[PDB]
Amino acid sequence: AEETCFDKYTGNTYRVGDTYERPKDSMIWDCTCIGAGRGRISCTIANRCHEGGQSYKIGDTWRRPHETGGYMLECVCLGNGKGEWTCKPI
Amino acid sequence: AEETCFDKYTGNTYRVGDTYERPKDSMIWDCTCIGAGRGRISCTIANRCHEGGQSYKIGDTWRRPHETGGYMLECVCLGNGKGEWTCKPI
């Protein structure tokens, strides 16, 4: 037995030092059972986009051909706690 | 008139280039109306704690006397999209 945290969103009990993914509201948070005597959990959310094997900061842009269309796209990383991006024709 | 975004959480319309705060689920997201031809909004959330005039990364710790109790506290920055921290006596 070790000190634990209980995550009401995954429904699981973790031991202090465990790290895990918490699906919440169509996001994935990256969490750690800290404990701190009180079952305290620390979670971070990604503020970056991952597209086509590249990583982008929020506000970064990139251009690429559409994969079946062949017309150029300009894309921007939005983030929104989901690694969301948007592309449009150029 | 300029191109706009509509934020369903604040209920406001923004013009492209506007930045604002979006209260959502007891958090504050920092948003920008990007537009990108389609009313696209980009939002970031803080993964840091601000306590006693200091800034802390998630997982940072600090010690301080309790402000009315005078006993030592050990604190840790949890984050959780809220700049949340926890303290206990030491």
Side-chain angles (χ1 to χ4, degrees):
Chain A
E2 294 163 37
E3 181 182 339
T4 56
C5 307
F6 174 74
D7 189 293
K8 69 196 265 175
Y9 313 93
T10 65
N12 292 148
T13 296
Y14 300 92
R15 288 126 61 243
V16 160
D18 290 353
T19 50
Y20 62 100
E21 289 194 357
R22 174 148 95 184
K24 190 194 169 189
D25 303 326
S26 299
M27 299 178 198
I28 300 286
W29 297 73
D30 298 326
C31 305
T32 302
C33 177
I34 299 294
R38 309 301 178 251
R40 302 322 302 261
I41 301 167
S42 165
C43 300
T44 176
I45 186 63
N47 296 123
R48 287 204 325 188
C49 307
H50 294 280
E51 193 287 314
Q54 300 281 288
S55 162
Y56 297 105
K57 294 194 290 272
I58 283 174
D60 290 3
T61 60
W62 60 100
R63 291 166 160 173
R64 73 171 177 92
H66 186 283
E67 342 79 60
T68 53
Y71 47 91
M72 290 299 254
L73 307 169
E74 170 84 325
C75 302
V76 60
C77 175
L78 306 173
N80 299 327
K82 291 175 275 289
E84 187 176 18
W85 70 89
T86 183
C87 299
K88 55 160 39 298
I90 36 164
Chain B
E2 294 163 37
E3 181 182 339
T4 56
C5 307
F6 174 74
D7 189 293
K8 69 196 265 175
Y9 313 93
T10 65
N12 292 148
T13 296
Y14 300 92
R15 288 126 61 243
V16 160
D18 290 353
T19 50
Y20 62 100
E21 289 194 357
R22 174 148 95 184
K24 190 194 169 189
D25 303 326
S26 299
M27 299 178 198
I28 300 286
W29 297 73
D30 298 326
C31 305
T32 302
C33 177
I34 299 294
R38 309 301 178 251
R40 302 322 302 261
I41 301 167
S42 165
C43 300
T44 176
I45 186 63
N47 296 123
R48 287 204 325 188
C49 307
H50 294 280
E51 193 287 314
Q54 300 281 288
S55 162
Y56 297 105
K57 294 194 290 272
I58 283 174
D60 290 3
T61 60
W62 60 100
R63 291 166 160 173
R64 73 171 177 92
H66 186 283
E67 342 79 60
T68 53
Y71 47 91
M72 290 299 254
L73 307 169
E74 170 84 325
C75 302
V76 60
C77 175
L78 306 173
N80 299 327
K82 291 175 275 289
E84 187 176 18
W85 70 89
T86 183
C87 299
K88 55 160 39 298
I90 36 164

